[PDB]
Design a protein around this motif. Structure first.
Motif, short mmCIF file in Angstrom:
data_model
loop_
_atom_site.label_atom_id
_atom_site.label_comp_id
_atom_site.label_asym_id
_atom_site.label_seq_id
_atom_site.Cartn_x
_atom_site.Cartn_y
_atom_site.Cartn_z
N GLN A 6 0.84 -1.21 0.00
CA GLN A 6 0.00 0.00 0.00
C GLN A 6 0.87 1.25 0.00
O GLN A 6 0.48 2.23 -0.64
N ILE A 7 1.96 1.25 0.73
CA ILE A 7 2.91 2.40 0.74
C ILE A 7 3.49 2.56 -0.68
O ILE A 7 3.58 3.70 -1.18
N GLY A 8 3.88 1.45 -1.31
CA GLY A 8 4.32 1.47 -2.72
C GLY A 8 3.31 2.08 -3.66
O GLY A 8 3.68 2.86 -4.54
N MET A 9 2.05 1.72 -3.52
CA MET A 9 0.96 2.22 -4.43
C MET A 9 0.80 3.71 -4.19
O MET A 9 0.67 4.47 -5.17
N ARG A 10 0.88 4.15 -2.94
CA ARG A 10 0.80 5.61 -2.64
C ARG A 10 2.00 6.31 -3.28
O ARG A 10 1.83 7.38 -3.87
N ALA A 11 3.20 5.76 -3.15
CA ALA A 11 4.42 6.36 -3.71
C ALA A 11 4.24 6.51 -5.23
O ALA A 11 4.65 7.54 -5.81
N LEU A 12 3.69 5.50 -5.90
CA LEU A 12 3.50 5.59 -7.37
C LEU A 12 2.46 6.66 -7.70
O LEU A 12 2.66 7.41 -8.66
N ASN A 13 1.39 6.75 -6.93
CA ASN A 13 0.37 7.82 -7.12
C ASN A 13 1.07 9.19 -7.06
O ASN A 13 0.83 10.02 -7.95
N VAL A 14 1.92 9.41 -6.07
CA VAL A 14 2.67 10.69 -5.94
C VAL A 14 3.57 10.86 -7.19
O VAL A 14 3.62 11.93 -7.78
N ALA A 15 4.33 9.84 -7.57
CA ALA A 15 5.28 9.97 -8.69
C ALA A 15 4.54 10.32 -9.98
O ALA A 15 5.04 11.16 -10.73
N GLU A 16 3.38 9.71 -10.23
CA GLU A 16 2.62 9.97 -11.47
C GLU A 16 2.04 11.40 -11.40
O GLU A 16 2.00 12.06 -12.39
N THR A 17 1.62 11.85 -10.23
CA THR A 17 1.13 13.24 -10.03
C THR A 17 2.23 14.22 -10.31
O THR A 17 2.00 15.17 -11.05
N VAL A 18 3.42 14.00 -9.77
CA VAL A 18 4.61 14.86 -10.02
C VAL A 18 4.90 14.84 -11.52
O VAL A 18 5.12 15.91 -12.11
N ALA A 19 4.97 13.65 -12.12
CA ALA A 19 5.37 13.49 -13.54
C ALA A 19 4.41 14.25 -14.46
O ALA A 19 4.87 14.73 -15.51
N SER A 20 3.16 14.39 -14.07
CA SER A 20 2.09 14.98 -14.89
C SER A 20 1.94 16.46 -14.58
O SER A 20 1.06 17.10 -15.17
N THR A 21 2.65 17.01 -13.59
CA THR A 21 2.59 18.45 -13.24
C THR A 21 3.27 19.26 -14.36
O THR A 21 4.42 18.99 -14.72
N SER A 22 2.57 20.24 -14.93
CA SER A 22 3.08 20.99 -16.09
C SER A 22 4.47 21.57 -15.81
O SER A 22 5.31 21.51 -16.73
N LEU A 23 4.71 22.08 -14.59
CA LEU A 23 6.02 22.68 -14.24
C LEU A 23 7.14 21.70 -14.58
O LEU A 23 8.18 22.15 -15.05
N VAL A 24 6.96 20.43 -14.28
CA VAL A 24 8.06 19.45 -14.43
C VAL A 24 8.47 19.34 -15.89
O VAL A 24 9.66 19.54 -16.15
#
Length: 130
Positions: A6-24
């Motif tokens: 579950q911690i892994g799945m949360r970490a991936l949710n954060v990583a995909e949110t960061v990756a999809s942020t226009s600033l990045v």
């Protein structure tokens, strides 16, 4: 299922949110992407309680890391290959800070090409008493 999973799945949710942020994706066009990406990644690290929110390019060179000494050096753990193919993964590996569960997501440019990697990790030593 397990707490670690579950911690892994949360970490991936954060990583995909960061990756999809226009600033990045925009910052990848800067002469030094670290100038905008390091403060952004540190704010997300603080919000999420992750050990790290690492942002790297196609060569695995870091633009953002909680230790500024790591910026401009190669990501450690040997789990970049699938992400550079455009796949999101949840990976247990030994990073520069030790064994972690990481969610790793590709950064796409405006045309859908992979230009980099976001890695959000939690150290295994923080999930249960060693």
């Amino acid at each position: 299922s397990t707490l670690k999973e579950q911690i892994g799945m949360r970490a991936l949710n954060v990583a995909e949110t960061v990756a999809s942020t226009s600033l990045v994706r925009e910052a990848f066009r800067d002469s030094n992407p670290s100038v905008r990406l390091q403060p952004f990644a540190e704010r997300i690290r603080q919000k999420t309680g992750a050990e790290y929110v690492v942002i790297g390019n196609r060569q695995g060179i870091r633009y953002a890391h909680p230790l500024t000494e790591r910026i401009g050096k190669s990501m450690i753990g040997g789990d970049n290959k699938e992400v550079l193919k455009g796949k999101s993964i949840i990976s247990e590996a030994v990073g520069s800070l030790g064994p972690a569960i990481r969610g790793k997501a590709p950064i796409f440019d405006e045309n859908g090409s992979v230009i980099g990697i976001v890695s959000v990790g939690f150290l295994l030593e923080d999930i249960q008493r060693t």
